[PDB]
Amino acid sequence: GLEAKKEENLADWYSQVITKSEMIEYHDISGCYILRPWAYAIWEAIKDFFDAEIKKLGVENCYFPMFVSQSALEKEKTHVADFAPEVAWVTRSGKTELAEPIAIRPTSETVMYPAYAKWVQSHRDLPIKLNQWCNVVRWEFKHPQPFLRTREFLWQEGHSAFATMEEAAEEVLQILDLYAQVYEELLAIPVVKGRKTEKEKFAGGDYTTTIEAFISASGRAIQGGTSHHLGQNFSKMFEIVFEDPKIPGEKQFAYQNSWGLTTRTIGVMTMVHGDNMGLVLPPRVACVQVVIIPCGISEEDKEALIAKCNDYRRRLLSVNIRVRADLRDNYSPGWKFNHWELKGVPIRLEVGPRDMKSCQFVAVRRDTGEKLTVAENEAETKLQAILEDIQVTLFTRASEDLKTHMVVANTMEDFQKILDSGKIVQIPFCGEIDCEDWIKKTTARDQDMGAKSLCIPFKPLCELQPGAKCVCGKNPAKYYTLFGRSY
């Protein structure tokens, strides 16, 4: 069984859960982890959804090189200098030094935007809407954590270029809403949509929109996905331009966006829904939604029981429920109950001889442990209903927790008190970078780490009163901003 308790040592519980659910295997290189099928399948579910949705918006998939030349990486002001010591450099092939070192992509702006500049020769060439599913590398020496913060990770990065600001601004919010759908509708995780402050936005962009999630077990928030409006900053840098004949003597620089989402998704799912029995899969992304286990197991009664289990399997498959029949003779029914509970399968379907003879079975929900006796004839109906109820239940519980842990404060003193209780706080804020630094410094100083901004919510809990001051007291508030201790 799982013996680590989530409320006692969270980091050990997390390591136990991700390994005993067979999601993660550790590699011999720090910050690099093997995604076993149980975790990879969740990424595949997210991919299926998001891929279909961006195709509806006109985005097409592609694959750009993993390697960036020294010249291309350092040619334009695409990234702040603090990232320099975290680029992984290939310097030799076999035993002999390369003429010029080449970098592993940490993101693909510097490989994609020179090609965009080649491809945009007139108005007709826009828009360009490309996505790629790929791995990136950011070689930090801070402590890594499986799924949440790693050196190599899988993601998707979309990059779009448009003739007008309005088309681009529309896409930014559409993509952000798809990310919120990934978290809320697939993973049953509530998120807060907002704009990053000036300090936390992508430096080279116009503005950054974000979704923020809350991990109550650690009292910390974490960014779930991001959608940037780059404006014309990168088009001016890379000369992504066209000319209108109706406007002679003027360049038209493309308006650009970029957006990304990673396997961090899975880690947040694990941290939010996981419990002291192990992983808990939302039915929308569970590789296996129902596991059928023969229990209470004569020598032809046994064959009848096995055939009944396969009857349920085929009926469920027939109604698009993802189902596995664990018919292993080697393992005890208790062993199987435990194995699939650790893996978070939403429903265990128990079939024993007595129930078979009485044309019934037992369904056990993973989230609550509730057991239900179901008539055989209702199998497809009831189980679908139960799966839907599990999904809602998970979201509802997580939403309640966010509601208790995200609150309004209008003074530094109240903010400090609430923050130190392990919650995130919406405060009136002047938006200035220096003030944000001061908030981090003084909440660190006065705690009894510093708070960072998470986002400026699009829909704050309260509306800023006229003349309301920032918590710094010195400048008027520009907006309610969500702050907390962060991942």
Added chain:
Amino acid sequence: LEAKKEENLADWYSQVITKSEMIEYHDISGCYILRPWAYAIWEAIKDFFDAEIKKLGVENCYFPMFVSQSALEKPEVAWVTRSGKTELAEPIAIRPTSETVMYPAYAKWVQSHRDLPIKLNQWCNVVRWEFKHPQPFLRTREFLWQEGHSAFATMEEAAEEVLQILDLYAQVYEELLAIPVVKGRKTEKEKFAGGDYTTTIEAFISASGRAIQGGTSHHLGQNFSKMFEIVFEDPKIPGEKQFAYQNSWGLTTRTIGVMTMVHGDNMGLVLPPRVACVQVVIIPCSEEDKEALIAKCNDYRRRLLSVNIRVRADLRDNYSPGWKFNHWELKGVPIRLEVGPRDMKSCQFVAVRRDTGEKLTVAENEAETKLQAILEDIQVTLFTRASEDLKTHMVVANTMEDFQKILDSGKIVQIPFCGEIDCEDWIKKTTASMGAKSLCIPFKPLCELKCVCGKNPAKYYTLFGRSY
């Protein structure tokens, strides 16, 4: 398209892959951008192969790209040596293939025979930093592939899988890409040194008279399980351990390059309907009649989508119809569906098939039926022509002189062969301006069976050729 396939193939190829918007060049050599038109073909291959291996019980995963020095050493490898300006404690290698990352995990996952089989696949990128001359799709420094790695308790289930995977690869080439291939096994010289035997599919590119390996499926036997200690308890004998039997298999975007080299023509790319992102492109050729024509095009679009035909209506105002004809011809779209006002008012349309250029006039009410028929015929036609080509260019020669002569005509040859490494080296140096290498020992040779070296008897008919 200006360049001609029959004169300057390399230039023809560069023009076709760029004007079809499949490839863009990168500022590092041997690395190429896969634009959507190319990537879509890879996605179609992936959809097929992924479904098929799932039916065999293979599960997808993702192992790390980085290999430690020690694990790798238990070679044109790209080495990471620093992060920023900070030298790493130890250099780490980019995977050229994932045996050395996967099999330590395999050895930890296998304790009893109940832990077998293990059947894992990953769709990923690998890196082989050679300085030989690269070619888009066909031979590149970084490439997308799938690598499957399986572990079993017995030799027999492993052997079964090797052959099933090779047949899936032959399905990818022959059924999806309309490319005939020759199944066989590699000679001692050419087989994977880390395995017991290597099965392969070989394809032929007549424009260069050269063969190319399309995919590969190895039986590794107990080589790697002895090296990495992938062991399980003997079910009958107390205390005794057995080593697992293993396979690995792989397939890359080389597929798309072979498809381009085989079916492409002097008008550009030619897509087999089974992998074409767009199978039919609808092109329009009084304000009321303008609106009605657009609506008719949209009718065809919706009807073809309703019958699961992949269709785009190019209703764009900012491009001439002739520009569209040429654009979608360069891209190899199998069928151009032309609707003009007169066609609309005659309840008919024109379908132009890309492979032959034939223009068919089709009654409107038959749109869904006939177009499906035409798509099927295009697929078959492509395959049939390619097979004709292969049969024309693969012949038996039972003596060296004829073999050399056959080879210099730009063909590949099945010869009686002894199998010895020394002899294969001698055939290479003799036939040299490259000398011929062995391609495979065909499962089904042209003729039933001494070597063409004389000094030895022939162990098998072997297919030899100048190879990519």
